[PDB]
């Protein structure tokens, strides 16, 4: 099932070359789930994201 998420704040850019940024998202169906994800490209607050699988929380150092 496809799931949409709205970001809340941008934590910082990760990756070896800084090709990703790590952002905290919040859902649309129920504003209780808040998972952490990695995204590439320009991201700002209020962006709506399409998550293919909303099960695992992304992680990098």
């Amino acid at each position: 099932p496809i799931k949409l998420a709205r970001v809340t704040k941008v934590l910082g850019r990760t990756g070896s070359q800084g090709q990703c940024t790590q952002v905290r998202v919040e859902f649309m169906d129920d504003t209780s789930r808040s998972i952490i994800r990695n995204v590439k490209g320009p991201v700002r607050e209020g962006d709506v994201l399409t998550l293919l699988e909303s099960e695992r929380e992304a992680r990098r150092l």
Binding site: G12, Q22, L61
Partner: peptide, 25 residues
């Protein structure tokens, strides 16, 4: 602190870096 040390090792540092790049009359 242990929890401060773990959370610092789990999240990413960000913030300070200043990149310097780049009429009336």
């Amino acid at each position: 602190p242990l929890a401060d040390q773990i959370l610092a090792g789990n999240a990413v540092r960000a913030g300070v870096r200043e990149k310097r790049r780049g009429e009336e009359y």
